[PDB]
Design a protein around this ligand. Structure first.
Ligand SMILES: CN(C)C(=O)[C@@H](NC(=O)c1ccccc1-c1ccc(C(F)(F)F)cc1)c1cccc(C(F)(F)F)c1
Lengths: 121, 124
């Protein structure tokens, strides 16, 4: 069976498209980058459908944003984080999060430059 | 925007090649057998441009490159020759097998030492 469709130089896995970007940018720059490729930052919605994320090395911006006037974490598209997907770990005071294996999110200052993962589907 | 495949459903697809990582440690022969059982072979490096994803592969993993001591040449398990300009082969341990390491390096290793490995299917 075929996987996709996905941009030419992207990784395809269970019909989701992923791309790693090694240029370090703040969270806002990274979101803008994925958007310019008609994608978004990594969104984690299923350990089963996205089990390749166990294989990811290093730490990378994903699309999770913290709403301080709530107790809320949400994805870019406004959807909620569902249960048993990410272990959220304090690291720095901030409103953004870095993905790390295995299915961890480290709270990070949105202004700090990091590598990032875009995702499309 | 195109499709990638054909591949098995739980394999990674990149530029119409299928990849799978296995973190169980096996000697070279058992690693090759495991790839073959899934209609695949150990990693073969044929193109820096079309396999540039290999720049992101960390640590050391079996690939399908073997040594013919009687002639000193390196070749892939299927008998095909190693293209120039692709891999830098570096001594490590006395052996007739090679581990892939980034970036586009081959480290000589004892074929009987268990290591993690990478399987690959071409779709030609
Ligand atoms: C053995 N090993 C498994 C690695 O070295 C590992 N390296 C890094 O993840 C890796 C290493 C360094 C920098 C970035 C990454 C990386 C980040 C995100 C993605 C993403 F875009 F895909 F999200 C892919 C790679 C790996 C290599 C190739 C493919 C994959 C996989 F994730 F696609 F499966 C993982």
């Amino acid at each position: 069976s075929y996987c996709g469709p996905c941009p030419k130089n992207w990784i395809c896995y269970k019909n989701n498209c992923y791309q790693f970007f090694d240029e370090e940018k703040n969270w806002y720059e990274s979101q803008a980058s994925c958007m310019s490729q008609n994608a978004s930052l990594l969104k984690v919605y299923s350990k089963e459908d996205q089990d390749l994320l166990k294989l990811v090395k290093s730490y990378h911006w994903m699309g999770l944003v913290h709403i301080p006037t709530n107790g809320s974490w949400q994805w870019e598209d406004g959807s909620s984080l569902s249960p048993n997907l990410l272990t959220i770990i304090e690291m720095q005071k901030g409103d953004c999060a870095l993905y790390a294996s295995s299915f961890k999110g480290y709270i990070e200052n949105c202004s700090t430059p990091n590598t990032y993962i875009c995702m499309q589907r």
